Design a protein around this ligand. Sequence first.
Ligand SMILES: C[S@@+](CC[C@H](N)C(=O)[O-])C[C@H]1O[C@@H](n2cnc3c(N)ncnc32)[C@H](O)[C@@H]1O
Ligand code: SF4
Ligand SMILES: [C-]#N
Ligand SMILES: [Cl-]
Length: 356
Amino acid sequence: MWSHPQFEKASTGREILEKLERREFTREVLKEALSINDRGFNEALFKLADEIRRKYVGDEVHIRAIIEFSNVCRKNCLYCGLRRDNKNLKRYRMTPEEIVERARLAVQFGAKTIVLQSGEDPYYMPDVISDIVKEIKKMGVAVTLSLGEWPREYYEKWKEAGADRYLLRHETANPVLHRKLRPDTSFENRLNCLLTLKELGYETGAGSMVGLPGQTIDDLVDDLLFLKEHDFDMVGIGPFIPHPDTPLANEKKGDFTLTLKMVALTRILLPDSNIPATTAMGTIVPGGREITLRCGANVIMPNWTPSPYRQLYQLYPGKISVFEKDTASIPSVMKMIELLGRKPGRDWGGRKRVFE
Ligand SMILES: C[S@@+](CC[C@H](N)C(=O)[O-])C[C@H]1O[C@@H](n2cnc3c(N)ncnc32)[C@H](O)[C@@H]1O
Ligand code: SF4
Ligand SMILES: [C-]#N
Ligand SMILES: [Cl-]
């Protein structure tokens, strides 16, 4: 028997970068990319993702204004502050008039997509959502829905009402972990919803949280390969941020650098996808969304939920700032985009197929 020494770190890093540039996306390559802890490797990975972003989605940063119109949820996800078992949260619902008029104001401030997000609140489903969608589509913008898991019939009604896109983050592709953290449902249900949304012609968004309890690097590789397999139009990635009024209050927070590497690898794997710099990335690090837009992201989603509701959509601590008026976020992100040397989107920023 003979010895078994390891290879030098920088050359292994350079070899991983060459494999990524050559698009040899094996599980071992992705695992090693996520596992290397070297600032110089990471910076090269971010620059590769940024280069691919520049070439295949260009310099426009698309603004999607989010209205979080109800924090009522019938589910009990262990990570989420809106879970039904959290009795320490005041619940709200916006009326259709409030939602439509608030969307009109975002359109006037220049948002070209309105995102309607909520807890899984049966009050609205399906007909109130359809009415709201029809009204917002008259404003000349794209509509994205992010309402959770519903019957095919509801997704079909909302497509006929004019919805363009649907964001349903897959959360974790590990089906054992998925059921432990989302005890009302399953990864199989979540995937069935995603496949139904794609079949109905929505631009379909998935994406995962990084740093969930029980999740390993191998699980993150499985997330990347799941996203690649389905060629999603949008991918939303952010760190897990523990919420004090949930069972996961004392678990580790997700790591910002690892999450950034997930964004970068997602851009490399899916060069023409729409990838936001998520709210959670700006919560965990000051300037986190700006950094993420330099590592492969090309979308930003300013929070347009009005007072007095915005502070109650408490998915995780730190999500909401109340230091400025509730109309500040769209001008703020426009200023951010300008300071980055980028441009706001000129059209609706729908996903295109330009990578072959
Ligand atoms: C709150 S839900 C609302 C829409 C719909 N109920 C759903 O679950 O798809 C939107 C996203 O918030 C994110 N989220 C929830 N709790 C979080 C936490 N503690 N840390 C980071 N993200 C969280 C999840 O990824 C979830 O997909
Ligand atoms: S993640 Fe979505 S479905 Fe789960 S508790 Fe939170 S709002 Fe409800
Ligand atoms: C979400 N941004
Ligand atoms: Cl969108």
